[PDB]
Amino acid sequence: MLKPNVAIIVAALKPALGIGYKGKMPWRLRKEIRYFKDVTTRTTKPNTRNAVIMGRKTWESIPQKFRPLPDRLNIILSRSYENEIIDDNIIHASSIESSLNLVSDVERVFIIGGAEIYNELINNSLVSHLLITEIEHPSPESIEMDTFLKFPLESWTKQPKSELQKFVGDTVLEDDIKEGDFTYNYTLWTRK
Amino acid sequence: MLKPNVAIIVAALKPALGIGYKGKMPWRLRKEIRYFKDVTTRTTKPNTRNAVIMGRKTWESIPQKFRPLPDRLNIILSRSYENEIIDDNIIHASSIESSLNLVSDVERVFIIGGAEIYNELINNSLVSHLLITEIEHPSPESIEMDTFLKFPLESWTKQPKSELQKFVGDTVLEDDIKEGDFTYNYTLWTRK
Ligand SMILES: NC(=O)C1=CN([C@@H]2O[C@H](COP(=O)(O)OP(=O)(O)OC[C@H]3O[C@@H](n4cnc5c(N)ncnc54)[C@H](OP(=O)(O)O)[C@@H]3O)[C@@H](O)[C@H]2O)C=CC1
Ligand SMILES: NC(=O)C1=CN([C@@H]2O[C@H](COP(=O)(O)OP(=O)(O)OC[C@H]3O[C@@H](n4cnc5c(N)ncnc54)[C@H](OP(=O)(O)O)[C@@H]3O)[C@@H](O)[C@H]2O)C=CC1
């Protein structure tokens, strides 16, 4: 049985693993936006592309002129949708199982959020990598939030930086990136 | 209809998962036949129907006067078949997926046999659910059988009864149904 190559990509504030407040991210991290773009857009060969899968709320939080996310197939989930290919760049899917059946033309698949989607996928056997941007701040409790990852990190193994570099290819991975009061690092995890 | 979830519905004798002999089921479970009927017929949406898919041999095994099965779109597969709508109830097709392009009326899709169809379709990623009637008998080696399921069950998760109830909605699910020397239970399985 052929299966797609799927990873979760997310940015979280430690230690609680907070992901959002209201319907947005509690930070604006310049370099992290760029990493996100590169990682999700990069392919091993030209004239190929990846897909991104998101929840309706995340699609909606993207300003209209900036959607779909360029250079990648965008897949949007809503329990109100009918499976439908809108154009070459946008597909509507009515369940996770269908979403994973609509990625036949891409190289890699990235689950890009939000909370409910992440929580639904982390226990799917198809997900073989977690790409976590671990964020730190002097006083995390000062950062307001209502959305958290509920991942069983004990059943995942954080890999050495070398393994991440293997996955991201040519992208530069700086350590301990500072922006304002935040410090962060990109990480890669595999299943135990 | 684009990439629908499909469910396999079958009754098998444990542990070998035997399904027939000659071209017949080695038992007559009256309650099972009624459950089969309710599950495959019932819908939630307004003016929808479910679709049942079968191999050419299974079709031919239903007495001509009792086909098509009432209240469901019957889809019959054969490698010699052109993709054609016979009438509003019957479709001919050479592939599951090609058959699905000709439907629109549909809520749920069920694979109802036969053995070759079962063993082949099991490894098609459109299949998301298995409804297996697990039958037991004191002497499973007194019930001669020639046909078996070749299901990779290590890749599947047997769900709790609460999840089956939720799938079937209204249908009454009795436990440990005894008929003659047979004892059976209804089960649901999903992909890991
Ligand atoms: N820190 C990070 O890296 C990221 C953070 N986030 C954050 O996450 C938050 C949003 O998450 P959340 O509110 O949970 O929204 P999501 O983006 O997860 O969207 C949830 C919606 O997706 C649909 N959906 C979910 N499950 C299914 C299913 N099985 N089948 C079909 N449709 C499904 C439903 O749509 P409908 O209601 O239409 O049925 C549901 O309301 C924001 O705060 C956002 O900033 C987002 C991405 C990255
Ligand atoms: N226990 C249970 O719940 C059930 C048990 N059964 C049992 O199953 C047995 C019958 O199974 P079987 O004889 O194999 O018959 P099937 O109903 O599976 O028919 C096989 C035929 O289907 C067509 N076909 C097969 N594979 C495909 C494919 N991949 N794509 C398109 N068409 C295909 C072919 O038609 P062509 O040759 O024209 O190409 C082939 O000969 C019996 O003993 C019956 O009692 C059946 C249903 C339920």
Technique used to solve these coordinates? X-ray
Cα distance between residue A126 and residue A82, in whole Å? 23
Chain B: closest CA distance from residue A116 (Å): 19
Chain A: closest CA distance from residue B155 (Å): 9
The neighbour count for residue B29, using CB atoms within 10 Å, is 19
Which residues fall within 8 angstroms of residue A134, CB to CB, at 6 or more apart?
A12, A14, A184, A185, A187
Number of residues that this document lists for chain A: 192
CA B83 centroid distance within chain: 22
Chain A: closest CA distance from residue B154 (Å): 12
Is B5 close to A125, i.e. CB distance below 8 A?
A: no
Instruction: Indicate the Cα dihedral angle B155, A78, A92, A56, nearest 10°.
Output: -110
Q: Which residues of A are annotated as a binding site for substrate?
A: 32-37, 72, 112, 118
Q: Which residues pair with A72 in a beta bridge?
A: A50
Give nearest CA residue, ligand 1 atom 23.
A78
Q: Which residues pair with A179 in a beta bridge?
A: A182
Task: Answer left, alpha or beta for residue A120, where phi above 0 means left and psi between -120 and 50 means alpha.
Answer: alpha
User: Please, what's the b/e burial string for A126-143 (b: 16 or more CB within 10 A of its CB; e: otherwise)?
Assistant: bbebbbbbbbebeeeeeb
> What residues of chain B lie within 8 A of the CB of A82, using their CB?
2
The CATH homologous superfamily to which domain A1-192 belongs is: Dihydrofolate Reductase, subunit A (3.40.430.10)
Query: How many residue pairs from chains A and B have C-beta atoms closer than 8 A?
Result: 26
A56 pocket-lining for ligand 1 (C-beta < 6 Å): yes
Which of B14, B17, B19 to mutate for ligand 2's pocket (most ligand atoms within 8 Å of CB)? B19
- Let me know: does B38 contact B167? Beta carbons within 8 Å: no
Q: What is the 3-state secondary structure of chain B? A: CCCCCEEEEEEEECCCCEEEECCECCCCCHHHHHHHHHHHHCCCCCCCEEEEEEEHHHHHHCCHHHCCCCCEEEEEECCCCCCEECCCCEEEECCHHHHHHCCCCEEEEEECCCHHHHHHHCCCCCEEEEEEEEEECCCCCCCCCCEECCCCHHHEEECCHHHHHHHHCCCCCCCCEEECCEEEEEEEEEEC
Query: Measuring CA to CA, how many Å separate A9 from each of A37, A153, B140?
Result: 11, 14, 50
Show which residues on chain B lie within 8 Å of chain A, measured between beta carbons: 1-5, 123, 125-126, 128, 155, 191-192
Cα A88 to averaged position of ligand 1 atoms, centre (Å)? 23
Cα distance between residue B3 and residue A181, in whole Å? 46
Is A95 close to B3, i.e. CB distance below 8 A?
A: no
Q: What is the 3-state secondary structure of chain A? A: CCCCCEEEEEEEECCCCEEEECCECCCCCHHHHHHHHHHHHCCCCCCCCEEEEEEHHHHHCCCHHHCCCCCEEEEEECCCCCCEECCCCEEEECCHHHHCCCCCCCCCEEECCCHHHHHHHCCCCCEEEEEEEEEECCCHHHCCCCEECCCCHHHEEECCHHHHHHHHCCCCCCCCEEECCEEEEEEEEEEC
